[PDB]
Amino acid sequence: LPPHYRYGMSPPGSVADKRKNPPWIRRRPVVVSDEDWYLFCGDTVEILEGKDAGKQGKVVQVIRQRNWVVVGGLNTHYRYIGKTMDYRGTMIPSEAPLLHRQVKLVDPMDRKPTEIEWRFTEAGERVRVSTRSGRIIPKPETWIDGPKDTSVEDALERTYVPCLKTLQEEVMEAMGIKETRKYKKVYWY
Amino acid sequence: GLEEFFDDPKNWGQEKVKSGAAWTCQQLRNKSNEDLHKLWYVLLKERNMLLTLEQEAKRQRLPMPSPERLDKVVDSMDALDKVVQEREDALRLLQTGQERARPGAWRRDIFGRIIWHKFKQWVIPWHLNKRYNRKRFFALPYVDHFLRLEREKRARIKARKENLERKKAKILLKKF
Amino acid sequence: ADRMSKWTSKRGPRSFRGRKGRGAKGIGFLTSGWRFVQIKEMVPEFVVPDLTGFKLKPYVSYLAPESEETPLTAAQLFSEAVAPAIEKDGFEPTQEGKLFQLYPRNFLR
Amino acid sequence: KARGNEYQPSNIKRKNKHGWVRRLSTPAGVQVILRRMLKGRKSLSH
Amino acid sequence: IGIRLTLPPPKVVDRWNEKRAMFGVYDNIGILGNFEKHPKELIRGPIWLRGWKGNELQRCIRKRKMVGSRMFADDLHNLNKRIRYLYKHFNRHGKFR
Amino acid sequence: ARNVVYPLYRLGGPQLRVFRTNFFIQLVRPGVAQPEDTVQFRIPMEMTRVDLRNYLEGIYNVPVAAVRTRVQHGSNKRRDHRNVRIKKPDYKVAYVQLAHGQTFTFPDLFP
RNA sequence: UGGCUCCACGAGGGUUCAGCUG
RNA sequence: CCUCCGCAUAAGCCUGCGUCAGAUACUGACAAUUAACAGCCCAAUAUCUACAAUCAACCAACAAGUCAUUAUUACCCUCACUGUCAACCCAACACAGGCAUGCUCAUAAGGAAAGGUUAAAAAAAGUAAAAGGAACUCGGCAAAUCUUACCCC
RNA sequence: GCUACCUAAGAACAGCUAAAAGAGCACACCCGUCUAUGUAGCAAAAUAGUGGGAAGAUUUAUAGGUAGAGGCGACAAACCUA
RNA sequence: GCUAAACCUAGCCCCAAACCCCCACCUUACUACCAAACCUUAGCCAAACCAUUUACCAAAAUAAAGUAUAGGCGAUAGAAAUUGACUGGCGCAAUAGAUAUAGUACCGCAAGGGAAAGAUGAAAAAACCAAGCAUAAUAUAGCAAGGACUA
Ligand SMILES: [Mg+2]
Ligand SMILES: [Mg+2]
Ligand SMILES: [Mg+2]
Ligand SMILES: [Mg+2]
Ligand SMILES: [Mg+2]
Ligand SMILES: [Mg+2]
Ligand SMILES: [Mg+2]
Ligand SMILES: [Mg+2]
Ligand SMILES: [Mg+2]
Ligand SMILES: [Mg+2]
Ligand SMILES: [Mg+2]
Ligand SMILES: [Mg+2]
Ligand SMILES: [Mg+2]
Ligand SMILES: [Mg+2]
Ligand SMILES: [Mg+2]
Ligand SMILES: [Mg+2]
Ligand SMILES: [Mg+2]
């Protein structure tokens, strides 16, 4: 990505981004970086105002570099998508982003919009807890290998006995290469 | 070995090949030295395979199957290089106490900049190398004035930058 | 008359084109016929181990555990290498007679 | 006669006349390089 | 066409700002703080014009002799060129010779 | 290896060994109908015929009978939106003629 | 300060004859 | 139907009519020039070299000339690196100009003067012209056919 | 890198006549006498015919040297990047 | 109704504070490896020419003081002793503010010269008017109008 480039929800390596910001434009920014940021990709939040004012949803992706979150299935508009020719074709929804400090988190037992502060419990170390009550908020979130992946024990053999040898010297003695001759001294200036 | 410049013939054109989890510096630290030699050559053969596949993908204009695993293999190579150079650095510090593995000096070229001059391993000593003695490691009193001007050019760029950051913050606080 | 393009071996008179060359290292020396003598010791030898019967292979599993970063500091290598000093209660004084000298490096990579 | 073409190129003349080695030989040429460096020039010599 | 076609965003002014609301305080610090300060010492500014007025030549002369040895080199060169020009101008031009 | 200071050889010193080669080559489809037992390679600029022959002999156990090389110029003719020139790089191409009539032929990947 | 002859040469400067031709 | 053209090296450029795809020799992608030709040389200490070339043979000069190693010491390890494309370079231009050397003496190579009409004037170039033959003109300038003599410098 | 002069190591000069001459006619090349075209041109000096030299005080490639009241000049206030 | 026109932040300016900065590369730079720096500025310019002279530049508040002093005693020049010394903006807003989107592209053999320009928005994973024309060529007579007129 370049500087003076606007973050769309499309990833930077895409045709939509390549045609939204081609490398020969110049544009003004939008003002939005206070790293202490509490929404994460995979949480359940509660939209307050706008379209569907007062509803609950799931956070799919976070535009954390532009103070945006987009919630799953909510805050949506519509677009003729695909359709490849001069007829009506297909209609698909798209989801517009939503603003922080306007959407709040949901406690799994209170089911109300809450504000959450990063206090430091004794469990370890800094986990989301509410300020009006407790009931600590968790963190949001099968492969078997092929022919070119090692087992875990093969990756964790721990065959390094430390010694004062260079890799060069150790591999010399390991493969049995003998070098009788001696390196003549050069001037390094 | 041209059959190992190419990957497995069953995998040719399957749009996705399941291979993941590049190596990590911690695992490579746990491995030995002869083991790291062998793993370097394993990764080298597989990396030549991946570069061959990428070039042929460009030639036929079809999408490359697994760019993520070529990224993983270059990561694995760079991690193994880092690990072996850490062992070399640590042993050099113990036996010689030298921070850099190649000698140098802090010289001052014709333009009066202070450079790190890395040494260069000749055969005759320095005082009779004709070419070396043509090179100059000192400046002169006209380089003086030019040094002042370059210093102030940098001072101006830095003053511009700090002023602009403060102005950005002020208009941001107007907005919020 | 491009100043801005790089200067290469494709870009001059016949003598310039013969003298410049890319960054390939020398392999011998030129004498007295314009005849070239290749020195076998100047030619680098690839030291390649035997990889048959081997288990380390170019990826790991995703089932491998996560472990935190610990760069190999000289103090750590020291303690791991001379716990036998504690047992009692190797070091090179100079490096002239050594093949793989540490500081003014003798070796490649 | 027709007087357009005073530039008869040769890279030996170009490098010998305006090169980095020649600039750095003279103390006035060292100042030429220093001036291009201060101006910010992407190419300081031939 | 030169005229702006859509009228601008509204400039909204905080007249009861902190700087606005306390403008002018500790002027009269001398006359009603028994004279141990001076409002010229209340002035925040450059060193060479702070409690002084002068005209453009005198401002350049005073800037050269008060802060001139810390100036950047071509800023001095422009200042010396400007004193030289303004000398020629104020001493040799205009009416009223 | 590339971008590494080579140790000088004076008269009777050790041979230059390399452990952990820095050279990554790739096997390319020929563009102009090279014979049987000619493999084509794209190679870093610092790698000689002797380096490529010993690379293929040791790492891959290919018997190499002849190596030829050339330097391909890449085009500096493309321009940006700034009218500043885009340089496609310069690379090195080698033509490896196999031994004992081993007769490589480039496979049809991407079927 | 020469002077009188003086041969060859000239996309130099004039003149004559002959032819030839818009 | 045309051409002091064409091919090659040198110097200079630096991928600049190869394939494919796209838009209106342009754009992008993919390819490509492979050393045997050419370049990048020479371990020295002392020392040796009066004799031209020109078919070099008589013979002819004056302006008096380029090609050259030996005694000894040390030296067997052998063939790397780089150039290699094109309709090209210098003239702001796809410029009737500039551009070294070898070879072909009209080409075996390379090219196309006419977008399509019409057939006015003026203009450019060409060819032909009765009778006359410089009467033109500053002057036989240009054309046409070839020539003589005298002066001035 | 044009141009003036010089230095170093190179090259070119058909044919006929003549028989080593700054020789004759005349190509290649070098120059630029006359005319005509051209003039924002093909060209910030060209084109077309006509012409002068063409074994030499010749032309010419490559590299180098002389630098501004200076260089260089077979003096034209000539040339020294239109 | 075409061509357009409109926009606001990219940055910049002046102050304050505080002293700042793996490889290859002097050979033909960006190329693995072989037998010496140190010397008064001049002149334009004022003197209405110019010839002695002619401000400052070569760290020095306010006043003494434009005084003593110098000087074709003229243009002008000119002391000293002594004397009290926390960031902001009635700055620019894209021909402006920096040359700067860049010392780039382009020009020059070289030193060197040296540009231009962008504006949909919360999300694009969504309207009118410069000149010039056009809609719509012209009808005796003339600085193109004015007095007028039913016109
Ligand atoms: Mg004559
Ligand atoms: Mg021209
Ligand atoms: Mg033909
Ligand atoms: Mg026509
Ligand atoms: Mg007639
Ligand atoms: Mg008459
Ligand atoms: Mg008459
Ligand atoms: Mg005539
Ligand atoms: Mg003659
Ligand atoms: Mg005449
Ligand atoms: Mg002359
Ligand atoms: Mg005269
Ligand atoms: Mg005269
Ligand atoms: Mg005067
Ligand atoms: Mg501007
Ligand atoms: Mg500008
Ligand atoms: Mg209008």
From Swiss-Prot, chain A:
The keyword Ribonucleoprotein belongs to this UniProt entry's keyword annotation: yes
GO cellular component: mitochondrial inner membrane; mitochondrial large ribosomal subunit; mitochondrion
Protein's GO biological process: mitochondrial translation; translation
Keyword annotations: Mitochondrion, Phosphoprotein, Ribonucleoprotein, Ribosomal protein, Transit peptide
One Pfam family named in its UniProt record: ribosomal_L24
Modified residues (Phosphoserine): 10
PROSITE patterns xref list: RIBOSOMAL_L24
Main location: mitochondrion
Domain (KOW): residue spans on this chain: 39-72
Subcellular location: Mitochondrion
Similarity comment text for this entry: Belongs to the universal ribosomal protein uL24 family.
Protein name stated in the entry: Large ribosomal subunit protein uL24m
Organism: Homo sapiens
From Swiss-Prot, chain C:
Any Pfam family matching the protein: MRP-L27
One GO BP: mitochondrial translation
Any one Gene Ontology molecular-function term assigned to this protein's record: structural constituent of ribosome
Keyword set includes Protein biosynthesis: no
Keywords assigned: Apoptosis, Cell cycle, Mitochondrion, Ribonucleoprotein, Ribosomal protein, Transit peptide
Keyword Membrane (UniProt): no
Tissues expressed in: Present in kidney, liver, thymus and testis, and at lower level in brain and spleen (at protein level).
Localization terms from the record: Mitochondrion
One Gene Ontology cellular component: ribonucleoprotein complex
Function: Component of the mitochondrial ribosome large subunit. Also involved in apoptosis and cell cycle. Enhances p53/TP53 stability, thereby contributing to p53/TP53-induced apoptosis in response to growth-inhibitory condition. Enhances p53/TP53 translocation to the mitochondria. Has the ability to arrest the cell cycle at the G1 phase, possibly by stabilizing the CDKN1A and CDKN1B (p27Kip1) proteins.
Subunit organization: Component of the mitochondrial large ribosomal subunit (mt-LSU). Mature mammalian 55S mitochondrial ribosomes consist of a small (28S) and a large (39S) subunit. The 28S small subunit contains a 12S ribosomal RNA (12S mt-rRNA) and 30 different proteins. The 39S large subunit contains a 16S rRNA (16S mt-rRNA), a copy of mitochondrial valine transfer RNA (mt-tRNA(Val)), which plays an integral structural role, and 52 different proteins. Interacts with BCL2.
Family named by the database record: Belongs to the mitochondrion-specific ribosomal protein mL41 family.
Organism: Homo sapiens
UniProtKB/Swiss-Prot annotation, chain D:
Keywords, comma-separated and alphabetical: Mitochondrion, Phosphoprotein, Ribonucleoprotein, Ribosomal protein, Transit peptide
Positions where Phosphoserine occurs in the chain: 25
The keyword Ribonucleoprotein appears for this protein: yes
Cellular localisation: Mitochondrion
Coiled-coil parts of chain: none
Gene Ontology terms for molecular function: structural constituent of ribosome
GO biological process: mitochondrial translation; translation
Principal subcellular localisation of the protein: mitochondrion
GO cellular component: mitochondrial inner membrane; mitochondrial large ribosomal subunit; mitochondrial ribosome; mitochondrion
Family according to the record: Belongs to the bacterial ribosomal protein bL34 family.
Subunit-level organization: Component of the mitochondrial large ribosomal subunit (mt-LSU). Mature mammalian 55S mitochondrial ribosomes consist of a small (28S) and a large (39S) subunit. The 28S small subunit contains a 12S ribosomal RNA (12S mt-rRNA) and 30 different proteins. The 39S large subunit contains a 16S rRNA (16S mt-rRNA), a copy of mitochondrial valine transfer RNA (mt-tRNA(Val)), which plays an integral structural role, and 52 different proteins.
Protein name: Large ribosomal subunit protein bL34m
Source organism per UniProt: Homo sapiens (Human)
Swiss-Prot record, chain E:
GO MF annotation, one: structural constituent of ribosome
The protein's name: Large ribosomal subunit protein mL51
GO cellular component: mitochondrial inner membrane; mitochondrial large ribosomal subunit; mitochondrial ribosome; mitochondrion
Protein family per UniProt: Belongs to the mitochondrion-specific ribosomal protein mL51 family.
GO biological process: mitochondrial translation; translation
Keyword Transit peptide: yes
Chief place where the protein resides: mitochondrion
